[model samples]
Target: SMQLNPESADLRALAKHLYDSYIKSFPLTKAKARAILTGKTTDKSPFVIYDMNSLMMGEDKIKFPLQEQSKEVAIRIFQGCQFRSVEAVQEITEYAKSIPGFVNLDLNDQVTLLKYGVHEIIYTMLASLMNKDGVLISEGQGFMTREFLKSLRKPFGDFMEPKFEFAVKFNALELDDSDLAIFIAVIILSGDRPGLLNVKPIEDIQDNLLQALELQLKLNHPESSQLFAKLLQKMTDLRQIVTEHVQLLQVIKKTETDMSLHPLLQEIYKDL
Candidate 1:
């Protein structure tokens, strides 16, 4: 267990350490994420769904019957979706343990926080990986256009568009990794989740993190006093997007009887 006094020097140090670790743990640097989002990258990793042309190839590329092959394609697409989000969940849980006072919370609250907050974290993290044109998907091998993604099956498109819309506005802020790290911590340590047993301690942690973020923003970005305010608004926007995303998912779950969404996504949606 760690001491969590807001004014404690050690508590502040731990928050800085958590922020440092988060930036290092992120898969892409600010530069790489920007390049991918802008379609300026030359990396050539093989992609499951490489482009609009590839996605449109559809049944023509499959030798099996439409019913069987379409099922396989759906499963593969589902797995790709799960892989990105599940890795995010796993990495975030590991990062949370390093934040002072986080691991000491009731295990259920910790779970609740992660469950409710992971979508926000993942989407925020992906903001740097988006641009006006589209988000770089399929590990940078595929650049799915806004138009192309919306042309997909009903709920699949619905699930993705809100995220892209949020990202377009979010990426405009152009926060570097250090600022982003603190932002992620703030999102994860939210005290408002239902079933939270001890909100004060989490709120205290959030307060200190915000203070530290304020100081850092002042020092690192002297020209931009409004950055923090902009970021706060973006977080609110992200919440709305997440709300819309979950609603679409709920509708899809009701309608797509044969579709098998990944278990972790299903659990997160149910919990939220």
Candidate 2:
């Protein structure tokens, strides 16, 4: 639905450049990540897992093998989760600002897309923090096994299982951090976001980034036929996850009297 000029080729280098600069989560790549999650490793020998957000609160890692949940433990977990979402918003915003031609759009559209889009970014970024059985939380510092969450008392377990499976499926694609940046650009620049000031330009930007992502995917995942479509299809699943996650937040407020969502999440949940 958009573009021309030799400037079109600029994406050839820019998406990769943006990712190289902003993928600050884990220095760990697919190989090293596998080693950690699988309980095997190389040079690092033994590794420690700490929750990045929790570390900031002076409450980093907790109950290593997994612990039972109570209102007390749940709020602690929610605090770390909420803190991570706030950070995710900032990281994605800064990354989006760097995408070619993005800032040329109206500022209203800019903020609107970011609000809607960061949910997808946060979920997609989780793939880097996960393997088949569990996710590494707080920017790859802590491990929360899938089994642990699923076994928690209320069978509230259903809440994270879809997302966990989504993360697992996505990680299997093996696209490195470089392919991921434009994938996020495609998500954030979509014309479909509600309250958009101008759908056409947003769609146009998404188009260019989409093509770049496809090209990058093929280059990075050669021999894996159908990989591009499979990846694109995940946007549907991720968007669904966003809806469910928000709904759960509202219920969480109603049912858990002692727990308070950070005001940051309160603002976002109010908007979305």
Candidate 3:
């Protein structure tokens, strides 16, 4: 029989050990990941047996590294946005190869792919989060679509506690709205640990907060009155916090003079 929940001390210890070991073998998978797992039991010291089922799932199975998704999404978006041409695809792929100062050279080719996958997902996720229903965080930033944002949603997480646990447990099922919202917030705040990038500046972040607030405001009415009021208050608080750096957020947009960065970015986006 299998005890799936975290109710049994034996199961908890087995799962914890398995979880820790899995990560040590594949540390690039996710940050602070936990196991909400169940597996088969046996006559052997239940502890020694280790859930054969859970072990089979392995380190490769847990989080869908966002960068992997991003590479795929970038291509699709370029195609969807009509950027497809043999020249375009080659250009973008080549560009991806030239991103300066990327730090994953120490990894083998397979592990490097995993690292890229993680980076792409988080990069697109944060890019989407900063947009408020398509509002630009900076005058120079481009808009991200809701569909594109949703594509990168599963891996983002932010709360006082690590939200990676939610991915460990809930990723196989539906990625719910509340958790989804928190995930976006997490990406914005935490900047996608274990990935190759850092957080965007505060100005871009404010655009996302304000845009989301606008969506909340649109729901105004007696039916939504209580929730609406709370949302507005929260928005105001966020505005106060974000406004402190309003003067510092003007990032200059680069013109497409360089050949490699654009395709690489598009290539990165292909997964989502």
Each candidate structure's count of clashing pairs: 0, 1, 27
Name the lDDT of candidate 3: 0.29
Which runs in model 2 stand beyond 4 Å of their true positions?
A: 1-9, 24-35, 38-71
The 0-to-1 C-alpha lDDT of every candidate, in the order given, reads 0.72, 0.71, 0.29
Q: For model 2, what is the error of residue 93's alpha carbon versus the real structure, in angstroms, after optimal superposition?
A: 1.4
Residue pairs clashing in model 2 are 50-141
**Which of candidates 1 and 3 is the stronger one according to TM-score?**
1
List model 2 lDDT by residue over 1-272, tens digit each: 23554655676776766676556543445555667676686443222333333333424333221331344544555555677778778777887888777899999999888888888888887777677667765444456767666664452555667778788778777777777777888888989888898899988888888878877776677688688798789887888888988887777677766665678767667777
lDDT of 3 by residue, 1-272 (tens): 32344434432343333334333332222221111011121211111112333322322242212442244433323333232223333332332232221222333332333323333233222232232232111111222333333443222111101213222222332222322232223222222323423334322443443344333333223244244344434333333332321211111013222113245444533432
* TM-score of each prediction: 0.82, 0.81, 0.19
Looking at candidate 2, the ten consecutive residues that score lowest on lDDT are 60-69
Q: After superposition, how far is residue 68 of candidate 2 from its true place, in Å?
A: 17
